[PDB]
Design a protein around this nucleic acid. Sequence first.
RNA 1: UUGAUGUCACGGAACCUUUGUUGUCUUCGACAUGGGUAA
Length: 1237
Amino acid sequence: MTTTMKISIEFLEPFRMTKWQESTRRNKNNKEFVRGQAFARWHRNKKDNTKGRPYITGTLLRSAVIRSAENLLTLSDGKISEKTCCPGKFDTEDKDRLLQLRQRSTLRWTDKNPCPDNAETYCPFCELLGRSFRIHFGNLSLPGKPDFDGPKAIGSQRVLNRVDFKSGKAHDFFKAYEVDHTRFPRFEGEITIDNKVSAEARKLLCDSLKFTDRLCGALCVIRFDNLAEKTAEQIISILDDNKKTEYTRLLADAIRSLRRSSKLVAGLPKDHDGKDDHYLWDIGTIRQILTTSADTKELKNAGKWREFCEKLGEALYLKSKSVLKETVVCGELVAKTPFFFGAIDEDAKQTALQVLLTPDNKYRLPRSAVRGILRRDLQTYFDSPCNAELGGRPCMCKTCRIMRGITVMDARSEYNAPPEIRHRTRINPFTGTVAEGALFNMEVAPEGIVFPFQLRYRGSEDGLPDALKTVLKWWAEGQAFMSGAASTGKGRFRMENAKYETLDLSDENQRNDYLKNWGWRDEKGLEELKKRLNSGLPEPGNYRDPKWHEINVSIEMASPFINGDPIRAAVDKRGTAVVTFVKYKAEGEEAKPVCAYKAESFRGVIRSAVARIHMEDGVPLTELTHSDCECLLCQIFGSEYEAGKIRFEDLVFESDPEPVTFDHVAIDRFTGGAADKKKFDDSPLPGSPARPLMLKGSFWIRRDVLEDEEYCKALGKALADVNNGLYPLGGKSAIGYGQVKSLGIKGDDKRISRLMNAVPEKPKTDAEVRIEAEKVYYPHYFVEPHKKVEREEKPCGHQKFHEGRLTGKIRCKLITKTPLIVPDTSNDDFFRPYHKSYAFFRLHKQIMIPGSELRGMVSSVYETVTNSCFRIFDETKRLSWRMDADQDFLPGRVTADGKHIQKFSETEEYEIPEKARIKYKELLRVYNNNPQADLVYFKHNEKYVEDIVPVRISRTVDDRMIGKRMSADLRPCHGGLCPACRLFGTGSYKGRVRFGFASLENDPEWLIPGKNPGDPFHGGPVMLSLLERPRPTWSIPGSDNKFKVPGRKFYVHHHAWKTIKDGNHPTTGKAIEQSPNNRTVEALAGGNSFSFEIAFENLKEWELGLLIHSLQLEKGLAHKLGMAKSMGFGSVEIDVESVRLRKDWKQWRNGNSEIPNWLGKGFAKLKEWFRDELDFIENLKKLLWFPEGDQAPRVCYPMLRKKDDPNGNSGYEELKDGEFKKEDRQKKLTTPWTPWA
RNA sequence: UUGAUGUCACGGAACCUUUGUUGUCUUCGACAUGGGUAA
Ligand SMILES: [Zn+2]
Ligand SMILES: [Zn+2]
Ligand SMILES: [Zn+2]
Ligand SMILES: [Zn+2]
């Protein structure tokens, strides 16, 4: 009868399945069909659509139970007392008809001859298998006969590889369908019986079923008995209405990043002023839509929220386009590093690579990866690469012999959360900028997750084997690099709390109980095993060292550190443009922000450092296509056709720092004020010499590489180069961030660390100016550049140090003459417990100057001393001019569209052009939005209209833009390059100089004593005047084309800080009254020393001389630096103290005596380009000339009305004649030190 | 819908290769007004 055993196969792993195939190709010839003879199959009731159920064939169960019977009869006794068994009568009538044949070898427990053909009850194994369609039948299927859309709907497809042991690159791969058991746990089937077999037959069937470990290709317990497309349309319609489609991908990334929880939408970043006009979240608005969607009653589940956000991001991205023993070893796999497993899918096109997430949004540890890693470890221990191929016969090598009885169980995590995302970019060596389209990201799991693990080895020897003992010892030590991206650094599992128990041998009592109780492989079975397991681990019988030696690193940084993360900047509470990289761990269902440095960035820096120094055959080794070759760099690091030998790891900080906000502003080189654009800000981590950041971490090296000679020589050379401060870490190195002091190496056994470890007087001035004792001098004057430039030579690359080039470091000292100010611009109420108050810069209670300000100060001097393009300039500004009553405007009206305007007689039509509309549009732009706050009139020549104005007299509008004034040569070079852009760099071309922060050498000084003479750590307040906007309209008198931009703007040096110190106006002599616009700040007394360093790379002989000349200038001339330079606050002079170069990785040289050759040869290059041009060089020296003794100039800004300041000051009302004219403003400001009075 | 006297798929790691890097001194002085005049 039908012994209907509804054998619920409670899988502990996702069982596998095959894609459906039509009956036409259902034959032995089909490769996919013959391959998929051991997995499940998808039955389709109707072929029009993919509706159906999964089915299971009973032949697979028959094969599995027959194999179990083979093993059990081999193990237990060899022969039963009641009846004697045989090895098994196996024969084929025809080989072709059989789809597959047992190509392995059976067991030989008995040598008794094959049974007679003509017999009925002659041995148990034969009478079970047949030869006497009446025993098994059987088809397992889903419970209740459900219906589903299809195999893709109920599960998913995953792809498996075959990695060669030697190279590492996979050769061939295949796909299969996997289905989880969390919602499909049970299966229902039946097994028949003739009611003829003996009791031992049923006993063999039952205990063989209990003994089976893997069925349907998975370890298991064989237990017998809308409203999103509309949202996407709304967002894309808002973007189309507001245009600016370039931000679609950025918005997609930002809105996909909000899948953590619904609480982050409320705390989205705000405007700089705290308003609600963010440039992305208020483009419409989108913020209101997000808030009211988050407040919806249905979208309260975290799962619903995250999947809705994912759907929105995905749709928006697409729119944008014999003695036998057993062992029960267990343990816990604590993850000490992020891990990644390839589960690439097609739905999430935004992210190329995705981790293997379970259907319940939890992480998975597939058995394939574990088995592959075990294969790698055992093969590299035995030193016998298994060169077997698919099919044939199972090779009898030691590795396969050991692995023919190894099983490992799948595991699942518990930290259910959306995985974080990590970016990656490529760098072009010849330009130092990201390549086109080299922007991609991969999704990575968090760190600090526990995975249960259980190993069941069914051996045939006494105890565990020595190879497996050594492998487990290595794993417990923490040498188990399991997950992928091991070259990057991801994946490192340490077996914690190892606790094993060698179960037994092929006995008849404890083995019988083990068989009786299902082998304790279920959850409760695992519990009552763990209650009796014994701690410890067996010792190795013959220990072998691992092939991966650990190296420690201790990097010390003495400056702020920054690592970019643009996507994370769109969700932080503060609206900062650039923020440091942050990683999240798993601290018990918590995500603490942990600051770290990207292992990818560190690996890239090391790779570039080792690449730049070596020389293969005269080529730089960077421009080589590589591909297939045997370079040293390829051999060490790896290429597309070979795995690497070095693995890096993330570096963390040995402190608890918190970010500090800095922000910069660009300055136009002609107006002297802010250039608008965007006040970009950054939040670099804090770091100072007093409390330097201690970066600590460790990377791994292969033992063969360490033992090799040339490889360790290359590594030592690269480490020495990094230690010499030539490859700063992090980003924004051109400002001063990411400077490195030292790099110690330990644990290398003294194999790599062994390789690594009269200033000429300045010249005298020659300029001469005549300062009067009564004349009043204007604050700022203009310097005119040359007509043309020398934008001819091609810039040098960054592939390798070429012959005749120079590289090193420069030390200098800065001493202030006049009072210096560097406001914080962070806290507005420091002195004031409305009015604004600021103090001097402070990082760690150690006052210093930022390096970017010095960068700008010296870059301006270089750009003016050698003619070059205006690097920062605004070329979109229309200038109006309020005209006077000297004109011939005619009346008219604008009502008839198409017919344009018409004339009037009292107090036959003219067409209007389209350009005239633009002038009217901008005319009513600050007419209403003034700071100090349809009948029309038109013009004509014969049929055109020149200008259109509302009122009888108003401001004439300029036709050509401001940018079309100066010559084409001086216009900015956005992308051969002018000499200034060659050195400091460009948006496309990286620079070749680096600056750094300043620091003190003596105790501080202050202009005024503090509120209480308690300590010198703080200064006192001083009242400033009113700082007011510049206006180019004064420099450009009118609309005539003859007027053009004169050049650059500079402030002369004078002594007016005395007047500001006490309550006297710089001009009218009155006291400064309290008001919301006035300013109060701190001040340092003149005479404070400072010190800072400059680095350089790949400089010509003449270029280096110019930079030193452009930096120090010469005694008697000083730069200008600080706040409120109009009133003469802050003058600094740079004095060189040491110049160092480098000749080789081992040898450095103090080239202190060679500077006269460079300085002398610097002017030689000037004669080559410009022969007789010296006025613009001489004019610069006149502007920066310092007031010597008893030559105090009088500098002030005159006011409007002469009646004001009755001392005799002439105001601007009557200054527009005699002294200044309409046609003399440009030339009057040409000569420096020209008194207006 | 499994078709019987043979399935080591417990015969296979989405594995390999790429620095969110570059370019910006928290800087700062001149007017604003529409008519007046006017048949
Ligand atoms: Zn037999
Ligand atoms: Zn083998
Ligand atoms: Zn190569
Ligand atoms: Zn240029």
